[PDB]
């Protein structure tokens, strides 16, 4: 069993599919966009995954699946997973407002307001498998 099959419009990397969405959307509206596509906002967990995402990332900035339930103070990925790998830009994560996470052109992460509108968002889903020969 080899996991590398993706549906049409989705790019492969390791055991996952990635959709590099385009259009002016808020963090929560970008979240809803991925659910409609039978996926979820991107969950970065390795420097190899980040390296791939940076190569296909929009220069303007992309929305990533990281945020806090307020009754947190701690950021959590949309799938439920906690932050192991981190690619925070210098001075991030902030406490300027004291929020939602966005990926820069450089691949680096920074805090942004939930109502901020960005022209891109990255989705992810588990890649399907080819049965053994």
């Amino acid at each position: 069993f080899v996991c590398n099959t993706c549906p049409e419009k989705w790019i492969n990397f390791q055991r996952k599919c990635y959709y590099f969405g385009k259009g002016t959307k808020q963090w929560v509206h970008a979240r809803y966009a991925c659910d409609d596509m039978e996926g979820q906002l991107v969950s970065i967990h390795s420097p190899e995954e980040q390296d791939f995402l940076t190569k296909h990332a929009s220069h303007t900035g992309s929305w990533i699946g990281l945020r806090n339930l307020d009754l947190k103070g701690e950021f959590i990925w949309v799938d439920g997973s906690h932050v192991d790998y981190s690619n925070w830009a210098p001075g991030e994560p902030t406490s300027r407002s004291q929020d939602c996470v966005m990926m820069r052109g450089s691949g680096r992460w920074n805090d942004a307001f939930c109502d901020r509108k960005l022209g891109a968002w990255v989705c992810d889903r588990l890649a399907t498998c080819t049965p053994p020969a």
């Binding site: 963090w27 809803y32 103070g73 004291q98």
Partner: protein, 208 residues
């Protein structure tokens, strides 16, 4: 014909975990007033509860309370309300969303008034909750570890401080029987920025 769209109570949102938003339309003839709900995303809305009330001055007050998602509200979803009437010429449209900006946990201060001549069996307890942002706050009073009814007290509307924050004042008249039972009254403030568990509280005593 005026319309007002309220944000969820920080108590319903962070403590009760069941937020709701209310659209109030103050006005009459054939009151076939329609209160329609919609989300900015285009996703479906939960079922709203309608209530129409005749006031002591020949005016009709109709409200629609929509239950919202805890995570949907906190993440930034915009909820809209359309009000149509056959006497009104053009649809009334109000929108609501989470106030996105800086945070500051409230500072709670509870005071008790001294005995005034000709007021032995009663005292007034006051509370100053200040330097918080956003303005959305929940002010509660407690006795015997249980929440006193909302009607017992009166909280002022959030006004701006000399700085960047906000402030509210709460007044609670108490009876001699209450402080003689247990002379400890708690003033609770429920707020987005209050750490931990979105709550700050201070106790007061009629005559420490």
């Amino acid at each position: 014909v005026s319309a007002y769209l309220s944000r969820p109570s920080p108590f319903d949102l962070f403590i009760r975990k069941s937020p709701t938003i209310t659209c109030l339309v103050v006005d009459p003839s054939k009151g076939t007033v329609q209160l329609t709900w919609s989300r900015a995303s285009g996703k479906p809305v939960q079922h709203s509860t309608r209530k129409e009330e005749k006031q002591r001055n020949g005016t009709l007050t109709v409200t629609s309370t929509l239950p919202v998602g805890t995570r949907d509200w906190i993440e930034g979803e915009t909820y809209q309300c359309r009000v149509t009437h056959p006497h009104l010429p053009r649809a009334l449209m109000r929108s609501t969303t989470k106030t996105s900006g800086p945070r500051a946990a409230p500072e709670v201060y509870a005071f008790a008034t001294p005995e005034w001549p000709g007021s032995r069996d009663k005292r007034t307890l006051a509370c100053l909750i200040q330097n918080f942002m956003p303005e959305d706050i929940s002010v509660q009073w407690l006795h015997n570890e249980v929440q006193l009814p909302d009607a017992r007290h009166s909280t002022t509307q959030p006004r701006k401080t000399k700085g960047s924050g906000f402030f509210v004042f709460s007044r609670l008249e108490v009876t001699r029987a209450e402080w003689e039972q247990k002379d400890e009254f708690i003033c609770r403030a429920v707020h987005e920025a209050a750490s931990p568990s979105q709550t700050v509280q201070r106790a007061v005593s009629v005559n420490p």
